[PDB]
Amino acid sequence: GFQPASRISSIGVSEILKIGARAAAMKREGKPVIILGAGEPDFDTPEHVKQAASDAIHRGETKYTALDGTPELKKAIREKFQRENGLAYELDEITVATGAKQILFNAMMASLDPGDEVIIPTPYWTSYSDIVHICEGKPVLIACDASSGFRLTAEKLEAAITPRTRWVLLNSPSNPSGAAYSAADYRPLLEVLLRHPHVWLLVDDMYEHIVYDGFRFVTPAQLEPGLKNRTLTVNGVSKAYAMTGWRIGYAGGPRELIKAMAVVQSQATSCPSSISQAASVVALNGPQDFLKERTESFQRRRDLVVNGLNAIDGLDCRVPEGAFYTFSGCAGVLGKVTPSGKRIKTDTDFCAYLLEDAHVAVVPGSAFGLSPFFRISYATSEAELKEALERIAAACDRLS
Amino acid sequence: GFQPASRISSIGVSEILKIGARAAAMKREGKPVIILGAGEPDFDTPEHVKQAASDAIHRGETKYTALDGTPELKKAIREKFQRENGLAYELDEITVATGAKQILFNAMMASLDPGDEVIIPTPYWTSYSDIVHICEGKPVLIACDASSGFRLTAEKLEAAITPRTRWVLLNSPSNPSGAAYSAADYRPLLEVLLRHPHVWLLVDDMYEHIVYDGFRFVTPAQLEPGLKNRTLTVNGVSKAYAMTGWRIGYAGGPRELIKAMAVVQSQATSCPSSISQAASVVALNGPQDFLKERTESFQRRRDLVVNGLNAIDGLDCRVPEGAFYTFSGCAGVLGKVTPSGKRIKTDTDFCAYLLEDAHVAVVPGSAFGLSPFFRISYATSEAELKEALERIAAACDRLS
Ligand SMILES: *Cc1c(COP(=O)(O)O)cnc(C)c1O
Ligand SMILES: *Cc1c(COP(=O)(O)O)cnc(C)c1O
């Protein structure tokens, strides 16, 4: 009889998976369901990156690499940080792993002891707290509502820090709100952190290259040199280059942390795929102009969803600054009754109604730690979004 | 300053890496050291496997897959276990990870609580005990000397089992010994394990397809159906297909352990590379005849090393059954003096003399937990092996 380790005892089944399972069963019943939960861009890997992978395969780059990345890829990353972020890292301050997921995992495994706290602003994707839990740490969730654009404030950060705080997670743009920090937004938070030298910064910049309206992306180790010696700047090719299947993430940070992360990586995975690494060299080093057209395509779909929802009675949707999610408010539908007699008390109730009665799957704000809201991923076709918006509107109009 | 987590406090630097670094420095100095430490086969990924990868890239198989493997790869693994090992595993009993390294890591992370014991027969590679350490377990090392062919015996396994024993590691063929368990070798251990239902079997079959002399490969869950509900059968494409850089390992085992491993994998890596998975489908489903020529090439090189060492007074080398390592005794050189006046007291001293004065780098048995021996990897060219054996013989002749 199998007995799971205690370290996974606090990891449950995500509400997102439960929703996915219900939608899947409904399809088996013969009920087509639109699921608005895409977690990867609906673009392919760029052709020149595909060709670089094929060339590496042909040349026989099929052997183990250096544990935490080829020198060539580390140099491509160093150049990316300098070119794109005005951020200077040495080669021994750079690490490469199997996705940004493993970057985050390695960093927590390399640092957290039982009871160590990690401050996580919400709304947030629970994947972050599951990583903290398996490393025996304590997630400390800090709710940030629309009044601060879903962003952490200096006052809330200061009040959240305790003797056990080891990290603060700063993820911008984020899943599910799409909120991004400008330099003005970051500065008061970095001032707080300058006064807390034992608190390290876990910076997740994965949506850097999906930002809208001309937003100038910045990152804390760039803005505040006084925090560079305790910041892990996490990034990767998954979202920027539509390379989620390739599993390459990377980071820049202090050499002693990078060294500890390599100890974890040596136990967990050894080196990431040599083929994906070779692909990622050319993703970073090659032409970048194609990113503009993809951003414009995402932004057109952002506007479609935001404007669609703000034409529906009961909903109020802010304009996300980046990533490919909307996090619309739905306070206006609470208290209404469905045609079948059900009272809509929570955003959970509302999303369950949209699923069963409108055959559209969205995720309630309750699952991300802030209500009353719901998340749409618009990394899908304009046609599917238009149909889903029509169904959501019709279902909202049937509430009374 | 950075404080590493307690969970890596027992993981140090491997003596193998220190030896490789010193050998590498000598070569930079113009001393043409032959380093006999290859841990991957010196063949390339088969052409048809390369083509399948390039085809999958071109088709756009660049997205996240199912967390623990595509249905196509799980089906190919299911057929491999049935066709090659007579083992019947369901789809929910199969998992795919970033190398067999991650299979082992996930299994230990999913099961071990602090203080849980894992029995590790020695001679062993400390990579196994490092994994147990980072999962907060206690490696229980059981030395198996040449009198049992470097294999675990029933009496030693029975004596080593305690209430806290969670796993016994059964790795056949072995790095560093090259020894493999026949059915007759396994049977008394399996009889012991039937009497201890709390002990699970961690079966590392990675060198399955590098076995010699017509050896009939067998694996515990096939040999003893009464243990299949608590055996993890670990395997992978790295060694069989020369695909170490692609990072794909897999396992068959009880559904509840497979489920818990997926919880770990979701925090550590998400899915392994979609491209490597597609290559591995064809590695497993494709033609296997090429393995014959590779085995014959490996066996010729094995014979070079065994016969070469046994022509040197003071060395006694057993014939390995599989993998590409010899683990020769060197008791007959202990007590002798080098031309520079150093007395050779340990296999450590002997190997340092071979490095500095014969310009051949091998690893002493002390590094694997059994003396007096030394390990050679013969996954290199016959010419390089013949030259290395000449140098070892000359250096042994100069002893007094
Ligand atoms: C996609 C994503 C990740 C995971 O990246 P992978 O490299 O695919 O593992 C981590 N953080 C954020 C904010 C992401 O969008
Ligand atoms: C090579 C090897 C491993 C590691 O396999 P990867 O898939 O490359 O991580 C594990 N066990 C044994 C016996 C091996 O030979």
UniProtKB/Swiss-Prot annotation, chains A, B:
Its cofactor is pyridoxal 5'-phosphate. L-aspartate binds at G37, W125, N175, R375. One of its GO terms (cellular component) is cytoplasm. InterPro entries: Aminotransferase_I/II_large, AspAT/PAT-like, NHTrfase_class1_PyrdxlP-BS, PyrdxlP-dep_Trfase, PyrdxlP-dep_Trfase_major, PyrdxlP-dep_Trfase_small. Keywords: Aminotransferase, Cytoplasm, Pyridoxal phosphate, Transferase. CDD domains: AAT_like. The keyword NAD does not apply. One of its GO terms (biological process) is biosynthetic process. SUPFAM superfamilies: PLP-dependent transferases. The modification N6-(pyridoxal phosphate)lysine is found at K239. It is an enzyme of class 2 (transferase). Pfam families: Aminotran_1_2 (PF00155). It catalyses: L-aspartate + 2-oxoglutarate = oxaloacetate + L-glutamate; L-2-aminoadipate + 2-oxoglutarate = 2-oxoadipate + L-glutamate. One of its GO terms (molecular function) is pyridoxal phosphate binding. Catalyzes the reversible conversion of aspartate and 2-oxoglutarate to glutamate and oxaloacetate. Genetic evidence shows that this protein is involved in L-lysine catabolism. It may have 2-aminoadipate:2-oxoglutarate aminotransferase activity. This is Aspartate aminotransferase.
